Design a protein around this ligand. Structure first.
Ligand code: FAD
Ligand code: FAD
Ligand code: UXH
Ligand code: UXH
Ligand code: ZN
Ligand code: ZN
Lengths: 230, 230
């Protein structure tokens, strides 16, 4: 770096294991000389609901509200709510977007789901047609750093939870790839709450160490075969 | 039937295709004599964020906030916010829970993701142990009624989106089966915006017609093989 990174962070507690993973990511990428910005969604009280308040001024069809159409037209006419445009500018500038979050129901916490729903709008993140490899965020990298309650053994193809790759599909493929991102391999820190004080220190250190050489990684082939196949 | 149904509905616009599918479900299950309740999350301005405002009493650990630990303890103590217990009463009474929503990033809209995050807490919907076939909502049925932008061709194993069942996994397996529901086959209404007025009417009618015999259906085998094959 010479590189800009955005960390989109979704945890309530600065003292949490997620808070420690976000802080070491800021510490290490800052040390390397990278430009670093963090969107701390709970501290921002980030609005998750997709509503007509996301368009300023007058609606494109006030009779029948269509969120997708309204947001697409508002984006083209620079008429989105400023909380959304502020995130868009951070994404537009970033070379890498890291998402740091605890797994909630095999997915992102709703506050982070709402960041994907509201910030990655038509006209900004993709066009129709104009998605997956034609997506408007091509050239950028993305990485999921997730923590779980379930153990690694529970997250195997024949464990109770299935392979972790099975829950990544909607986030890596349906969201990040659809927008044109190249996807770096996920960082999955399994079951930190029932690990010891060491162990948790270890996982934090492994993430710091990985970040040392993050710019030398190639992306995954974000395919059904990678997620589901043999 | 002789049965109670809760419809958890996530669409901003009553005149929408989702709105029509929600209304026809209420119409047909009412006509059958069933007891029917709808949680219209956007009309309720349903809170999606998992925060410390969801607990009203003394926290177990006021120094380091852990949402899971504090909501489990608050469920037991009856100190959860009333919007969450209002939803829990609806679920507790229901024999079948239908989720009606447009697909957002291969998942539920954030407002609905927040209902899952905040309503299905430990102690209410599962315990550890007490999950998957031992989950606390055993005996209840759930059904996802989803609408998409992508066509059915795009949601096939060789199409750009992958098979439709791939995105269902975090919802049907990671959430509904984990809480002990038996899951009925999803209702997927593909690409209503693309379709003719006649084809849209046909999709609404197919859902109404299916609901006529819903109580005779068996659940799917909510397994990795059913979602992913081989
Ligand atoms: C609504 C909801 C839904 C969920 N759904 C799922 C799901 O579908 N699947 C699933 O597997 N799990 C699920 N979980 C559990 C959740 O993913 C895990 O609880 C979460 O990932 C744990 O991460 P955390 O940062 O909150 O842990 P924390 O409790 O913050 O940390 C774990 C321990 O690490 C300590 N710590 C903090 N910083 C450091 C450091 N630098 N070094 C060492 N230790 C440190 C803390 O003091 C603590 O003792 C769910 C939880 C909730 C609330
Ligand atoms: C944030 C966001 C993320 C999304 N992510 C994805 C995704 O990952 N994958 C994906 O495939 N799609 C995605 N979509 C597209 C979304 O799933 C579809 O736009 C939504 O499913 C369409 O449903 P609707 O009810 O909003 O449609 P509507 O626009 O209401 O329905 C189309 C038409 O049906 C008409 N209609 C209403 N009622 C009836 C009736 N009774 N009979 C006949 N016609 C009727 C309406 O008047 C309208 O003209 C996304 C959209 C947004 C906004
Ligand atoms: C605390 N906690 C866990 O440890 C854990 C493990 C798993 C799993 N392996 O699927 N899932 C959950 C889940 N859905 C919720 Cl809401 C939760 N609060 C919790 C877990
Ligand atoms: C409007 N719209 C679509 O028709 C459509 C289809 C597909 C898809 N994967 O097939 N995905 C999306 C998507 N992620 C967004 Cl945000 C959206 N606004 C939209 C679609
Ligand atoms: Zn992909
Ligand atoms: Zn299952």
């Amino acid at each position: 770096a010479g590189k800009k990174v955005l960390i989109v962070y979704a945890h309530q507690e600065p003292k949490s294991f997620n808070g420690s993973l976000k802080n070491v990511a800021v510490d290490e990428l800052s040390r390397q000389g990278c430009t670093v910005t963090v969107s701390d969604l709970y501290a921002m009280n980030f609005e998750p609901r997709a509503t007509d308040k996301d368009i300023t001024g007058t609606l494109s069809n006030p009779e029948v509200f269509n969120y997708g159409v309204e947001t697409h037209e508002a984006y083209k006419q620079r008429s989105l709510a400023s909380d959304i445009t502020d995130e868009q500018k951070k994404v537009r500038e970033a070379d890498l977007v890291i998402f740091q979050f605890p797994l909630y129901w095999f997915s992102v916490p709703a506050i982070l789901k709402g960041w994907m729903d509201r910030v990655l709008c038509q006209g900004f993140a993709f066009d129709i047609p104009g998605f997956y490899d034609s997506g408007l965020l091509q050239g950028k990298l993305a990485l999921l750093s997730v923590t779980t309650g379930g153990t690694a053994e529970m997250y195997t193809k024949t464990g109770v939870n299935g392979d972790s790759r099975y829950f990544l599909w909607p986030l890596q493929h349906g969201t990040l790839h659809f927008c044109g991102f190249k996807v770096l391999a996920p960082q999955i820190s399994f079951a930190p709450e029932i690990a010891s004080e060491e162990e948790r220190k270890g996982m934090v250190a492994a993430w710091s160490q990985r970040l040392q050489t993050i710019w030398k990684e190639e992306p995954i082939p974000c395919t059904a075969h990678w997620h589901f196949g043999q």
